[PDB]
A paper describes a structure:
BRR2 is responsible for the unwinding of U4/U6 di-small nuclear (sn) RNAs, an essential step for the conversion of a pre-catalytic spliceosome (B complex) to an activated spliceo­some. Due to its essential role in each splicing event and its association with the genetically inherited visual deficiency retinitis pigmentosa, BRR2 is an interesting target for the development of small-molecule modulators.
Compounds 24 and 50 again exhibited different binding poses. The position of compound 18 in pocket 4 directly overlaps with the observed position of ATP in the C-terminal ATP-binding site. Perhaps surprisingly, we did not detect binding of compound 18 to the N-terminal ATP-binding pocket. The C-terminal helicase cassette is inactive in ATP hydrolysis, the motifs deviate from those of the N-terminal cassette and the pocket of the N-terminal cassette is probably more flexible to undergo frequent ATP hydrolysis cycles; this probably contributes to the lack of binding of compound 18 at the N-terminal site. Density for an additional molecule of compound 18 bound at two neighbouring hBRR2T1–hJab1ΔC complexes in the crystal lattice emerged during later stages of refinement; as it depended on the crystal packing, this binding site was excluded from further analysis.
Numbering used by the authors:
A (entry chain B): 404 to 2127
B (entry chain J): 2058 to 2320
Amino acid sequence: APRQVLDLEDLVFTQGSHFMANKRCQLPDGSFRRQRKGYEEVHVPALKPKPFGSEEQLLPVEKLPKYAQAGFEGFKTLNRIQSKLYRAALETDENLLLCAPTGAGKTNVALMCMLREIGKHINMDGTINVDDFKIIYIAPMRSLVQEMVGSFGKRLATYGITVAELTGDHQLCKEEISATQIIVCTPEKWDIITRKGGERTYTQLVRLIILDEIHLLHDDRGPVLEALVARAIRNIEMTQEDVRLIGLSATLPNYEDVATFLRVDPAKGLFYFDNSFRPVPLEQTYVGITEKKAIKRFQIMNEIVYEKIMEHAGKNQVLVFVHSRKETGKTARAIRDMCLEKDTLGLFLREGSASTEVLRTEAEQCKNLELKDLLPYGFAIHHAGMTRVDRTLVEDLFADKHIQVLVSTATLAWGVNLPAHTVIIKGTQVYSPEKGRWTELGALDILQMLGRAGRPQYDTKGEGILITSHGELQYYLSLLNQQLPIESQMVSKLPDMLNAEIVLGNVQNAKDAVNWLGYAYLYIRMLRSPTLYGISHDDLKGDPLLDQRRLDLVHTAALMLDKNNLVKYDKKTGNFQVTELGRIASHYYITNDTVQTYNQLLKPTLSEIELFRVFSLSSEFKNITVREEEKLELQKLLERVPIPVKESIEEPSAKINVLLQAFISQLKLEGFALMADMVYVTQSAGRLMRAIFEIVLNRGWAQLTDKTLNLCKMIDKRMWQSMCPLRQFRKLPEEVVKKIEKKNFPFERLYDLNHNEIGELIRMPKMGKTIHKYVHLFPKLELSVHLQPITRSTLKVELTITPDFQWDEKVHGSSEAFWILVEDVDSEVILHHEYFLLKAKYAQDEHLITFFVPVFEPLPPQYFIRVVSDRWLSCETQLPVSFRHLILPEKYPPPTELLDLQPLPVSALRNSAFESLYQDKFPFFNPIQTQVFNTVYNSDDNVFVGAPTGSGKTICAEFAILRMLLQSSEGRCVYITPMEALAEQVYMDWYEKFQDRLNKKVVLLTGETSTDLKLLGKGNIIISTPEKWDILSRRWKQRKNVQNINLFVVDEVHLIGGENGPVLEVICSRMRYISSQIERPIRIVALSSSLSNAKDVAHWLGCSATSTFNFHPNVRPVPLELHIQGFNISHTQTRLLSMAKPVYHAITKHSPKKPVIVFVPSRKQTRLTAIDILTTCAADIQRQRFLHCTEKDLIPYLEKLSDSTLKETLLNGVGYLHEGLSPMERRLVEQLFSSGAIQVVVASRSLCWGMNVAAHLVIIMDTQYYNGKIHAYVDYPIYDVLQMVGHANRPLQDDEGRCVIMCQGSKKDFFKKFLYEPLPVESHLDHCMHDHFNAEIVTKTIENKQDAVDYLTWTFLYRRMTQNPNYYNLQGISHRHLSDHLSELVEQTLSDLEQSKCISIEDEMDVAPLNLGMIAAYYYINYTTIELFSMSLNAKTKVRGLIEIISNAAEYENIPIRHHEDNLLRQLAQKVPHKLNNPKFNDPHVKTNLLLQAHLSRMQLSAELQSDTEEILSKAIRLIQACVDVLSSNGWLSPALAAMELAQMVTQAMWSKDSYLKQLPHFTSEHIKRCTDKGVESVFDIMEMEDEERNALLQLTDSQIADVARFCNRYPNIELSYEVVDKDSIRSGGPVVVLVQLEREEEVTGPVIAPLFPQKREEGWWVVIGDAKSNSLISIKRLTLQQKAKVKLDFVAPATGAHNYTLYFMSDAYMGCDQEYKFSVDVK
Amino acid sequence: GPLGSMTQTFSSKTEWRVRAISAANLHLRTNHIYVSSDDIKETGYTYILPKNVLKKFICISDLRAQIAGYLYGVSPPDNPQVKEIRCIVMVPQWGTHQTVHLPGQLPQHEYLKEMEPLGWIHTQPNESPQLSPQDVTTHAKIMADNPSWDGEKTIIITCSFTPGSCTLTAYKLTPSGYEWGRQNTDKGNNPKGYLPSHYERVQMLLSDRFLGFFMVPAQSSWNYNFMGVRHDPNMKYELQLANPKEFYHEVHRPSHFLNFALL
Ligand SMILES: Nc1cc(S(N)(=O)=O)ccc1O
Ligand SMILES: Nc1cc(S(N)(=O)=O)ccc1O
Ligand SMILES: Nc1cc(S(N)(=O)=O)ccc1O
Ligand SMILES: Nc1cc(S(N)(=O)=O)ccc1O
């Protein structure tokens, strides 16, 4: 509407908590005034309690819920207010507001609330699930926070609850937050924590927030409470997870509005107790002074305090609160001097009482001089500037009633439980540096101090005497007699508080801001008292909800934030756009005018002079002035400060600048205004300067980044870098460090000395050893670089950080943080930067960092790598990276020309069956397929086709196959693609083509060896991922079908450059090597994305230049319009927020009407981006534009979905796709997208290989994802991005595809280089050699070291070593460089194999396979895994021992999605029958450890976690068989059979339960109870039953008994016979040949039934001859069985003892099938 | 006529603070760098100074006290008449407004051994038509102590501060000038025997086509104008590959910080 710009300053209550909204004041009956010369006295008598009406008894603790009774340990009854509150606090979750006089017991009611919450999480084990919740206790003062951590921790200890305060550092503190159940903190700290949006935040766990002293709402600090509460309530709706709010308030007017603000039901959770509920009644005296003259008023005040004291001298202790640290002493000395002059010092002290002697002794032993002067007389001072032991001295001596007059500060009021019968508040004026002037004491301070009057069990009344100026009387009277209304100070912080909600994405536009402000306490007060807030009563009646008023306030705040460049505010739409500047303002708690100043004045050329001046201009300091009386002491400081100050002493900025400089130098100032101002300035210096640091670091400004990080460390350490770094060890003596600074040698000069030369250099030798220790304690890092050129303009850098210092957790804590800065030639630009954390657990280990930097020609002389401590001064290592010997790869050749041939008809295939494959789908092939057809289809040359994804390279492979089918009737083509999801897509299309239509055989390899061999035989087209072919083609010497391959097609071969590249490189190298052995060649066809070094791949695979098609990205058949948008926000959640509306704008700009896929980084983001697209649609020129079919057709699809949000978004035209969706849910969404019904689908990054949809427009929303293993963001592999871009390609429907990539600006350059140009790829085989060498030594292809070198010549690695030597750490391409490098690689790989006992080396030349290597190679298991199996196992390892041993295999580093699921598995681990040492989440092996026990005990469910279960089960059988082989080889029988049955357990999902009936389909525990009740415990037992008796025993369906009978017909029923040849003619040390015969009976033609096991299996058996009690495993053979089979076992007789053996027939699949036959064999 | 009655108290107004303030604006002059072109006949060697280290050199200097850097370079492959300046070496030094005090030991580092020494470069408070007699003596004495300084091949670049800018002019010694400077002992502004036939304009060019680099002391920094007592003609020093800190950086004047703390 016609908005108005308001003046916020004119709306502000300038008095803060001193604003008095009430015009009149009525005093309790009996009050009376009294005149006196220069002052008036108001006396208010003590209130009488309500006489226990309402028959309210104190609830005995015994009547409480039994779980809450421990928190009341050592009390008999709750107090009165707890008793009226116990039902609401303990028996309900109602939001509460409790108003009671200070000291009535509100904190105890809060404890009851916390107890309810704790009770929500006790199990039957009695323990508390301490990881399932947090409780925030918000308290106004830090000293109060610490006292509560103490009192709550002690009350809750008996529950195992941890209570703690949030400390200042940020990285160790989140570690603590994880184990803290009750966080005690201030409003501002909780505000700054929940301002940072990072989803792994523990704030999700918060179930209860206590807001103590909520009358702080009236303070200038109150808007923080408003922002917290509003954010919490809006978030409760955002997530529908409830949070309980408890407000604890003094008794003041507008409490009903406070309750509305907290969503308290007045009728259910609002309790108001008046001031008569003060536990100790309070006679109050208000002394209001009329004198205006400073001198006379000061004297009058000292007079009044003396007279009041004398009313209590020797009858009551008197606690006097004053305003300063110095004033405690000045006032105590004044009072006792006035006593000395009037002979009254004796009323305080009885001369004949040991109290006087205690005072004299403790005085004489005291450190404090004022405490000396005062303690003998009984006068004490207490304040923050004293010793902990002196403060505890005065506390213990006052509680002991030794001190009679304690003069103290406000800190004592808040931090210590120290009451006094009498309290005097001496003056209510206080100096506020923020306000720049003397103000009145805060109301919270006043309430707390007078709350300290009356000792709860030693006094029958208390006496509070407040001394103020006369014109303030009404104020304090109101405050202390229920009559000072609580108002909202929100307007005073509205722009700042608004920016925070914009930065969090909670407020995206002015309408959101109006809604948000509707949760403010401001809003309720505006409605209930409009004229207080500048709203006329006519204004209200014309705007009853104050919509227009709130819109105006939001408009004004928005324009302020926009003027200062924190927000971009569109007046027309009302929209808000976040900025980096705004984010920094919010996250560093900086007011918005300050970041405008920083943005305006910061420049990369800034020197320390302008940097100090820029800091001193911050708005936090705007009210600071230069008082005439400080101008002298400031001049003295201005003309000696080490940083020159440009401007005059007349300017506040120069006083602020000098004050910081004095604080760093640790100077003692004399003015009291100057000292308080210095405290205020320096207390915020730290975070203000850290905001500057972050601004300039992210902008890349190297000089200023160094200066500002430095100034942060000087501020925190309180010293300049000029000082000896050694003084950062507080434990060192100042004397010796000053001796060292005086000696003026380089600090590093100390690294070259033994502990003796150190003492000798410093001219005192006693300290050589201690200095040596501290010298090597100082953090210090060694750096080295491996430079790795990618192109002539992009350089990969691998940086090794080697720690070079002794760790000592007393000085280093548990971590040390650094910045890695990569700086250009001139040290003026930060080319790259990142945070580095050296953890104590890794203090001695090298750390490897990798990153990219740009380079150019002519090569610059050098870059620099600085590694700088984030917190230690003078703690840096800089490594010049010189380029004088860098070898650049040659510039890549031109692509192959697209030739503009006539488009090729299907007719060219000259074959009606073949043309039947494509005829219905298109008339012509695309230009690339046209260009390659002649070579692929009409020749046998190995061929390479390189071209963008979406170019149709798969039809090129089909050309090669079709040719094969004409040459060879039974041709074998093997097709390798690097991803399983791709393999399954290709299998479903090539089944249809070549099996359904052409009647050939198409198979997909499962990975099980026995079945894959049969598939390979019977298939003409064999589809496999690389590993499944590696396992098969290793044994090519003994597998004719691997050599009899006509055609080898490899797809997406550019992924050789990526993570799983070595396996792919190796199998391709092997197929070349075989083709050259058998002398009838295997044709190779390679398909790839556009490669810059395509020629090398072609050479490696034997492709002639005439048959290598290296096409460039711009020849994609459907033209690709690719846009890369940079976003200069380095905080991920905020950068994603800023991409949210650009996503929408891109849809409307590039694809208003045609399908759109949005790729987002996480499962969580799919739903949020879907919803946000919908929100943005609804407020736009089109609504529901994404739904293209009517609502009616969509209903059957909605019925089947379990996600309700997915159905809302699907209705509005937007789907999403993520890992957690059921497979058919995903199918529904995919077909809705294919059919055009919905226009947009938001997919997660992880699905980018298994999506069977395509789009006209792809938007990639950010290019990084959070890895939970390493707790860091990781850049999308470039291969993923190319695969995402490839989804923008509809050849039949669109004239073009469009793609928008949205990324951090620091990544824009990289993408432009590696998406618009073809891709350089490299081998990483030299990092994955061991298991392949091991296979080739088992297979006899490598028999010596020469063989390993020749082997290497076959590989892509070897080719790339001559083209790009520096990438592989070569310094030349000469024959001998290559030979020596190959020899080193060979040597170190064979050394590792030998040390692992996988191979042997004889004569240092020849190599041979060993037992372990053979098992590694056969089961395709990492050689380190098999090593660890040998080292971990034992001749008597438990079944659970196996369970863990196999769990720590190297094959299991794959699941980090959720740490909190493992914190829930901390409870899941109690149930699992297996027992081990410790639970440590954040380790993929523990997820495996537990997710297995879940399988064997059929435990629960999940979505993505079940797809995780299935990939663990894809390896368990191999690992178990390897253990069986290791045990059998060593000779240990017991654990061998134990692992043989662990195979049964993993297949059939059951533990060692004797009842094998859990294997039968549709069976339950009651079914087994009934079967065991009738005598049936065996599967053979149920099938022996007469049919009807069984049907009566088990409650049955028809299909259910049919499933049971299917299982019983596939269940093994093997009859066994054993024959010992030469049964009575065998001599010791000779042949025992046992022949065993196995008859299946029934019939067998089906795989193993096992529903809980994902992969299909065939039944396997071990025959094992052994001896029990000896554990002598003798002879074992593994077999597979088809009805009839016979097997021989070999043994050599061990003696002539002539005794017995047991014989075992063990399944690897079924439980209960195991036979045992006993046979004795006498020697001869 | 007031003694005591109209009293006034002296407040120190130290000089280095004003020079520090004005040094913080040195970067402005690097956008206005002028080479004087009064040389003629393209006769001798041609020297190319890369802009990047020229600008760093200006930024680390002082408007009053001279600073100096050693020049190292090479000829382009097939152009022996061009000397490219590849490196500027900053050694421990102090200076006044008329001259610079450098150690006797020339730079010595493995990275430098494939380069040839091309002379030195120094800032100057004001333009001058003639080359300084201080400069002629300094070049001459370095030459007599170090036979690697060929008189036909080593130069002095003066970088003169004009208000608003810098002017660069390049000279070399003549045989007359070498023989005079090496026996000269008068440090004044007009010593006996000095002549304009003692030096000669050489042609100089500023390039953006390649980058130079710095080397700086290994264990200390280069700027001893605040520690002149800890400086010594005989002092030895190593070098490292690194960019120099600016004139008024904290590590050049540590006494200011340690003595303000002890106040
Ligand atoms: N996760 C979360 C939690 C809270 S709160 N007030 O419950 O701690 C506020 C905002 C949030 O985004
Ligand atoms: N691997 C693969 C490649 C291609 S394309 N259009 O680049 O040739 C399409 C589908 C695929 O599954
Ligand atoms: N210029 C700039 C860049 C970035 S970035 N692209 O690293 O996130 C963050 C903040 C910035 O001010
Ligand atoms: N020599 C000179 C040059 C300039 S300039 N290049 O800024 O306009 C200004 C003043 C000067 O004295």
